[PDB]
Amino acid sequence: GTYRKLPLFEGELPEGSYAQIVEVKPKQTVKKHYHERQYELFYIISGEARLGIGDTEYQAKPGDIFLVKPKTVHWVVNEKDEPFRLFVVKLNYHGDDSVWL
Amino acid sequence: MKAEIKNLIDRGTYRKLPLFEGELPEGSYAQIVEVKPKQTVKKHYHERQYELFYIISGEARLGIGDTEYQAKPGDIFLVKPKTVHWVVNEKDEPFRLFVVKLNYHGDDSVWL
Ligand SMILES: [Zn+2]
Ligand SMILES: [Zn+2]
Ligand SMILES: [Zn+2]
């Protein structure tokens, strides 16, 4: 819902590890949230978006890499017809922890 | 937050560029890997670390256990531990990939 979520290497990734593509549907926004304990590593694959982490908003283009440490708030705004697609890795992942602002 | 590649580590057959050093949790690491033109990375296995590859640019015969893919941009891979991998760069282009290491408690790398 809101953005797609395409897990890879399911059951193959060590304890607390996780990897997946996500696809932020076009001209949609992902709302302010944070993770209690998990890290997000992004590699921006295609499209363009506004990406906030803590106190900084980036104009995320492909080939950018981002880190979201925990208790750090993030959002994306896609203002493009093309979907925003990113490679995600989650570190110290204890399952679902998204506290949604 | 954003990745600024300002640190190069040179291993001759290639170069490794770490990312977010100190920022990542224990057992984690992330880095770009540049396999310099016409070069190969020789057969090698990792004690326990896992290596997730996202292939950024170029083509290089990539070999994980028994399957040699031709790693193009957009491919994703995993090299579970105790798995023999290597890379032959074919082009006059760097073969570049975003790597994360999982279960990395320092250099578990070993080479055949
Ligand atoms: Zn997110
Ligand atoms: Zn390796
Ligand atoms: Zn694969």
Residue numbers in the entry:
A (entry chain G): 12 to 112
B (entry chain A): 1 to 112
What does the publication say?
To investigate protein HHP adaptation, Elastic Incoherent Neutron Scattering (EINS) and Quasi-Elastic Neutron Scattering (QENS) have been employed to study the dynamics of two orthologous proteins from T. barophilus (Tba) and T. kodakarensis (Tko), which only differ by their optimal growth pressure. X-ray crystallography was performed to obtain the structures of the proteins. Both present very similar features: their structure is dominated by β-sheet contributions with turns and disordered regions connecting them, forming a jelly-roll barrel structure, and both present a dimeric quaternary structure. The active site is located in a pocket inside the barrel and is conserved between the two proteins (His44, His46, Glu51 and His85). The two orthologs differ at 16 positions, and most of the substitutions are located at the protein–water interface and involve mainly polar and charged residues, with the notable exceptions of I35V, located in the hydrophobic core of the protein, and I100V, located at the monomer–monomer interface.
Interestingly, the catalytic metal ion coordinated by these four residues is found to be magnesium in Tba PMI and zinc in Tko PMI; however, the structure’s resolution does not allow for making a definitive assignment, as the Van der Waals radius of both ions is smaller than the resolution. Tko PMI crystals were obtained after one week from condition E8 of the Structure screen 1 + 2 kit (Molecular Dimensions), containing 0.2 M ammonium phosphate monobasic, 0.1 M Tris pH 8.5, and 50% v/v MPD. Tba PMI crystals belong to the I222 space group and contain one molecule in the asymmetric unit, while Tko PMI crystals belong to the P31 space group and contain eight molecules in the asymmetric unit. After model building using Coot and Refine from the Phenix package (Tba PMI) or REFMAC5 (Tko PMI), the final structures exhibited an R(%)/R(%)free of 0.18/0.20 at 1.7 Å (Tba PMI) and 0.23/0.29 at 2.2 Å (Tko PMI). Hence, our data indicate that the extent of compression of the protein hydrophobic core is larger in Tko PMI than in Tba PMI, presumably due to the presence of bigger cavities in the former. The appearance of VFT behaviour on such a fast time-scale is intriguing, and it shows that side-chain relaxations are strongly coupled to hydration water dynamics in Tko PMI. It appears that Tko PMI’s dynamics are dominated by cooperative motions and that high pressure can destabilize them, as highlighted by the increase in fragility (i.e., decreasing D) with increasing pressure, while Tba PMI’s dynamics are dominated by pressure-insensitive activated processes. On the other hand, the temperature dependence of Tko PMI appears to be stronger, and a sizeable increase in the confinement radius is detected with increasing pressure.
